[PDB]
Amino acid sequence: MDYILGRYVKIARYGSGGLVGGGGKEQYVENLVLWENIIKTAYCFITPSSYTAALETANIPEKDFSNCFRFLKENFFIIPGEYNNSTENNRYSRNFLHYQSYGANPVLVQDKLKNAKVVILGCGGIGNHVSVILATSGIGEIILIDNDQIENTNLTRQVLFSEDDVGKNKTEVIKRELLKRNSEISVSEIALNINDYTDLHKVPEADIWVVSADHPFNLINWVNKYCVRANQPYINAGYVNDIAVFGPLYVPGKTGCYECQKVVADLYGSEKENIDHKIKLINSRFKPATFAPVNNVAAALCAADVIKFIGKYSEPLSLNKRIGIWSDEIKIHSQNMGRSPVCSVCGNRMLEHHHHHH
Amino acid sequence: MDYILGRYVKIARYGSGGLVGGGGKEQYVENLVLWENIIKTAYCFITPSSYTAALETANIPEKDFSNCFRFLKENFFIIPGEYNNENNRYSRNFLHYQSYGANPVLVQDKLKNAKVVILGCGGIGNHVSVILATSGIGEIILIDNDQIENTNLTRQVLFSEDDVGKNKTEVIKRELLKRNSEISVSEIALNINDYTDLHKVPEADIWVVSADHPFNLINWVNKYCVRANQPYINAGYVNDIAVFGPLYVPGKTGCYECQKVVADKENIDHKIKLINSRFKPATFAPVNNVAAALCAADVIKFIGKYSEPLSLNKRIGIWSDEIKIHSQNMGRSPVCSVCGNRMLEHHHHH
Amino acid sequence: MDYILGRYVKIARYGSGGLVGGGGKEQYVENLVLWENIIKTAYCFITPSSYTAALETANIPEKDFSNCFRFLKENFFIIPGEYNNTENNRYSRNFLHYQSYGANPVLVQDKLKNAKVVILGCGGIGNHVSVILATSGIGEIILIDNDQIENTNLTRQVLFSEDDVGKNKTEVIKRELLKRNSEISVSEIALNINDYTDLHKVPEADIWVVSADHPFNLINWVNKYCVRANQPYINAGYVNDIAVFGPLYVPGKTGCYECQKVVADLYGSEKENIDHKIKLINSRFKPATFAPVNNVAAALCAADVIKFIGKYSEPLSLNKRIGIWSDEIKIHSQNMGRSPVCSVCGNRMLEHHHHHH
Amino acid sequence: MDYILGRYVKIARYGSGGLVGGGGKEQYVENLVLWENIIKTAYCFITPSSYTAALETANIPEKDFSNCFRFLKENFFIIPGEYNNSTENRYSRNFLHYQSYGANPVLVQDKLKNAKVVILGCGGIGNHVSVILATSGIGEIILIDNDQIENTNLTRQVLFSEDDVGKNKTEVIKRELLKRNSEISVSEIALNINDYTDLHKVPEADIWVVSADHPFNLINWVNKYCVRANQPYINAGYVNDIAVFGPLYVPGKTGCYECQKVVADLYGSEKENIDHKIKLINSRFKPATFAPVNNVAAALCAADVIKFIGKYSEPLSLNKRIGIWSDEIKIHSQNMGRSPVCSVCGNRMLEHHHHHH
Ligand SMILES: [Zn+2]
Ligand SMILES: [Zn+2]
Ligand SMILES: [Zn+2]
Ligand SMILES: [Zn+2]
Known part of the structure; x- marks a missing residue:
């Protein structure tokens, strides 16, 4: 199961942490250290890749990677690779x-x-x-x-x-x-x-x-x-x-x-x-x-x-x-x-x- | 000067009295007697009329009429007759x-x-x-x-x-x-x-x-x-x-x-x-x-x-x-x- | 009666229109069309010219030209040609x-x-x-x-x-x-x-x-x-x-x-x-x-x-x-x-x- | 630390109080009681004098001398005596x-x-x-x-x-x-x-x-x-x-x-x-x-x-x-x-x- 970062996800520093996503589905995160880690994880999913394949290029410890993944996944910041099939501007x-x-x-x-x-x-x-x-x-x-x-x-x-x-x-x-x-x-x-x-x-x-x-x-x-x-x-x-x-x-x-x-x-x-x-x-x-x-x-x-x-x-x-x-x-x-x-x-x-x- | 009742005013009995208005301007009038008095006065103006002619026509004491008139004017429930005149x-x-x-x-x-x-x-x-x-x-x-x-x-x-x-x-x-x-x-x-x-x-x-x-x-x-x-x-x-x-x-x-x-x-x-x-x-x-x-x-x-x-x-x-x-x-x-x-x-x- | 444009006259596009003059005597003209019209007419006077000859030369109607001229004259943006003629002064x-x-x-x-x-x-x-x-x-x-x-x-x-x-x-x-x-x-x-x-x-x-x-x-x-x-x-x-x-x-x-x-x-x-x-x-x-x-x-x-x-x-x-x-x-x-x-x-x-x- | 009255200080009766200073550093003081007190104490400093040495010469409440002193000091009406060594410059x-x-x-x-x-x-x-x-x-x-x-x-x-x-x-x-x-x-x-x-x-x-x-x-x-x-x-x-x-x-x-x-x-x-x-x-x-x-x-x-x-x-x-x-x-x-x-x-x-x- 390959995941990919949504082309609609935006990032900025704000408060004691930061913002992920934009508009209605925007999330605010407290822990600045978590916010970094989410960014770090997100980067790994810029190309459509499986949980394991993305992890293998991350620097952060395996444990935090699982947290960020679940976060990004549930909020729809990373999405199944299938959901991306192009078509001629369709x-x-x-x-x-x-x-x-x-x-x-x-x-x-x-x-x-x-x-x-x-x-x-x-x-x-x-x-x-x-x-x-x-x-x-x-x-x-x-x-x-x-x-x-x-x-x-x-x-x-x-x-x-x-x-x-x-x-x-x-x-x-x-x-x-x-x-x-x-x-x-x-x-x-x-x-x-x-x-x-x-x-x-x-x-x-x-x-x-x-x-x-x-x-x-x-x-x-x-x-x-x-x-x-x-x-x-x-x-x-x-x-x-x-x-x-x-x-x-x-x-x-x-x-x-x-x-x-x-x-x-x-x-x-x-x-x-x-x-x-x-x-x-x-x-x-x-x-x-x-x-x-x-x-x-x-x-x-x-x-x-x-x-x-x-x-x-x-x-x-x-x-x-x-x-x-x-x-x-x-x-x-x-x-x-x-x-x-x-x-x-x-x-x-x-x-x-x-x-x-x- | 002539006033006329706007064609956008509705009335309904409600609670202790009733409603005059419609949209962002609807008004509950709690005192039944005053609501009735407002209808009585509004009724003079379906057909254009001056203030003094309408006072004649309605049969309520000038004291009350005057309130009801201001109520109607102030909410634009009645409006100058001029404002009404087509096939537009x-x-x-x-x-x-x-x-x-x-x-x-x-x-x-x-x-x-x-x-x-x-x-x-x-x-x-x-x-x-x-x-x-x-x-x-x-x-x-x-x-x-x-x-x-x-x-x-x-x-x-x-x-x-x-x-x-x-x-x-x-x-x-x-x-x-x-x-x-x-x-x-x-x-x-x-x-x-x-x-x-x-x-x-x-x-x-x-x-x-x-x-x-x-x-x-x-x-x-x-x-x-x-x-x-x-x-x-x-x-x-x-x-x-x-x-x-x-x-x-x-x-x-x-x-x-x-x-x-x-x-x-x-x-x-x-x-x-x-x-x-x-x-x-x-x-x-x-x-x-x-x-x-x-x-x-x-x-x-x-x-x-x-x-x-x-x-x-x-x-x-x-x-x-x-x-x-x-x-x-x-x-x-x-x-x-x-x-x-x-x-x-x-x-x-x- | 030749008039001539003063060498101390400057022009810049600004805001709804533009500026004419610069210094103590600077002016902002809010209507673009009139500003444009003012420079069109100012342009006739870089070389000396009567009011008449300048009117022909500019291709804007008499009514508008007359305002622009007065505007330029009143502020001494254009001045009698006599005031100008040096040798080495x-x-x-x-x-x-x-x-x-x-x-x-x-x-x-x-x-x-x-x-x-x-x-x-x-x-x-x-x-x-x-x-x-x-x-x-x-x-x-x-x-x-x-x-x-x-x-x-x-x-x-x-x-x-x-x-x-x-x-x-x-x-x-x-x-x-x-x-x-x-x-x-x-x-x-x-x-x-x-x-x-x-x-x-x-x-x-x-x-x-x-x-x-x-x-x-x-x-x-x-x-x-x-x-x-x-x-x-x-x-x-x-x-x-x-x-x-x-x-x-x-x-x-x-x-x-x-x-x-x-x-x-x-x-x-x-x-x-x-x-x-x-x-x-x-x-x-x-x-x-x-x-x-x-x-x-x-x-x-x-x-x-x-x-x-x-x-x-x-x-x-x-x-x-x-x-x-x-x-x-x-x-x-x-x-x-x-x-x-x-x-x-x-x-x-x-x-x-x-x-x- | 001896203080001396600036040779540039002028005094005048004016308003409810008076003026001390002349020029951009001019001060207007309202309470005429305080004014005269200021001049009293200024007089004491015509000669380069330490705070206490000037005080002996003063015929006013020891506390009031302290206010005037601080006024004349902050405004530069009195200045350190050191500031007067120059040349014949x-x-x-x-x-x-x-x-x-x-x-x-x-x-x-x-x-x-x-x-x-x-x-x-x-x-x-x-x-x-x-x-x-x-x-x-x-x-x-x-x-x-x-x-x-x-x-x-x-x-x-x-x-x-x-x-x-x-x-x-x-x-x-x-x-x-x-x-x-x-x-x-x-x-x-x-x-x-x-x-x-x-x-x-x-x-x-x-x-x-x-x-x-x-x-x-x-x-x-x-x-x-x-x-x-x-x-x-x-x-x-x-x-x-x-x-x-x-x-x-x-x-x-x-x-x-x-x-x-x-x-x-x-x-x-x-x-x-x-x-x-x-x-x-x-x-x-x-x-x-x-x-x-x-x-x-x-x-x-x-x-x-x-x-x-x-x-x-x-x-x-x-x-x-x-x-x-x-x-x-x-x-x-x-x-x-x-x-x-x-x-x-x-x-x-x-x-x-x-x-x-
Ligand atoms: Zn039901
Ligand atoms: Zn800077
Ligand atoms: Zn602003
Ligand atoms: Zn005189």
């Missing part, structure tokens, strides 16, 4: 170092993406944008579900549309634009909007559903019930005026669902009739105050989670979480949506006080 | 500007009459330009001298397979024109290899500085911009971490240098150099997008003058394998060699 | 300096040549001022001192050889000025000013340089005299550590040395026992002077004289007494502008007659 | 100045006689500096230049006669400095610095006076070389009518010319048709100079060299480039204090904090 090279640095065989990862089916449930700004990122990263099959046509005002949000495209169907244009970007992938269309809960029966099985159509406000409740019942993984994305929302990513039997922690606000009108008519009116007039850069942020983090989910190389960020990114301040909130045994949508079980008999 | 493609943004208390017509104008330079059309700048083009920025200037590689197709969301071989600059111009034929775009076949290259880059409302090579590009842009009085914004990544560096504005925010610090076996020192010499960034497409988008957001805010850019005095990092957004200080330093007063005056009368 | 470095101030160097030289300066006290500062003036072509100097060169003076008085200890200050500096400039005429007057009346011996001159470090109130007599004689003068000296120059007095135009003086309530001291002790300590006073200070004062004082006679820019000394520190970097200015109620140059003086016509 | 004028700054005047002169100073470039500034340094007692002077005296030099370089045109500058300066002080030695080196590498030929000295004005970038060279060769220097010159002097670079203990910013280098245009224009305009350039400015830079420069060598006071141009305006009362200093990160004399890089999490 289009997805700029993504291979990323997978390596998380400890995955980049070839396994791409194969999974190539073999995945992903449904875009709703093709406004967000689904639009997720599908590009997914196509562009090698998702094999994409199913575009929508029934609207490209309007005038859509051109601010939906980064794929020309002035030339007003009037045409959303899925039509997204479909041609994804084919321009990657002709090795297959894409289908379904002329459908979820107007009633039962419409969901018409949506096909896939590895995951991307669920982002801001209307109806309660689409997620539907999608959640349906997906729990139908054993179907989904991830949700959207916005609330100027906050970008994404998550949960729901995985049947392995995570919580949208109702588990009964997190988000219940909607009510008024008990007094004369003020309820006023509320009904005000809410009928409602249009969201959106901002395209927020659109984009939710969409990209969302697409990121899908890639991890199907590529099986890292824990997606939005397991058990609804996540809000603020745009008028540096602020990220996370709502807990971990599995609840007592959820009224998934799991069969009730919540009770102890009854002490004596 | 930017009209979804208009609500956003309204909700910030601006006048959407003036914000569009400011964007129309602005000029933005993208310095580095590789990925982040790529993406930033689209967002800016589609929000109605009047003129973009594209500054790259590289060719579209096959391998760039992963990060640079504007390009077809067809496009490999062609000039980065040139493709994105036809795309921005397809998306917005009203705006004008220019190309400058230039990469920045010496400090001196920046003299070729024109004067603009702001500069977007994305490109990853050379490692000390910001340094020159900074030096240049401090003495050129040129506002600029930095953006980029560090492996899987998206970064949108400080937005610098002439003698208001302090520069990329202000917060810098003095800083820190020659057999191991030889090895660290070598290893680092071999560095290739482990980079992740959805990251470019996050940084590009927040960077583009600060630009619209900067030109639109409707709320504070997040980037003032701060370098922001968004993680991707973790939910984490850290902010780093880049506020002004008095003793800073680049933007600090190096002069002293020794003269005086009586 | 000794003063031609200064000529650039005058040009840069907007003057006609020939007229400035003339005014210098046809002037006459009295150095009233040829001990160090005066010593130095005279060389500087002789060197710039002041046509006639009159040296006024009755002292002998002592060995100790060699520290402050730059013109003197060890050889010269013994001879008359006046006499040496006269030969030294002729060595430097055989063009000019120089006169001596073996005279120290010992009481007011001595000043009647000092001749009329375009200006008087008043340096002598004693008697303490020499300035006062010179003031009295010059106010009533209509004689312009400039004071110069030191206070230990500190070089001092000005005011430069101009009859009618400026303040006199008296104008800003004040009643001084704290006369000496209260307690008689200590008052005579302060007097005793001060009686023993000897100034701690520093040679380079002599030079600073003398030089600025000489500069004001050349400007006064040359009429090309304002002397700094007008209405001001200036002090330059030496153990600290620091320049202080003190007010000496006109006072209406001043004994020396104010009125007597009232008229009580009128005719109803 | 030539440098006696300078001696009170050194006393008043708290140095043994004799220590200081010895250092001056034992110093070697290089004048790198003998234009107007170098010229004038050498005279001042010579007449102040600098033991050895090394004049480096390869020019001949021209016609037009006589306006600036206050040592040259009309009979000297044609001769080498160092030749004439050397004769003129020997007339002024034959107790000193002077060498010549026929050398102009045309390339950076010519600096290897300049001898080692206590300090270099670097005053030559061509090329504009002499100082850059001299700075690099001096940093590398461990060589103190001080720089002086002019920008048209502004007189510049400083930094004085001291190897261990000071900033260098590049420790901060100025100019960053000329830039021309990035458009070719405009670069050719600026290229031509700049080739025609001659400075607009004013001799009185020369003198100011030269004098303050010499002053700093005297302090540096005599180790008696802080030179003014440490960590500073100083501009003295001549068309107005204006002095600016640019900060050139030491940078750890300087790319000429620093061993360290500038980094942002990296926060792990």
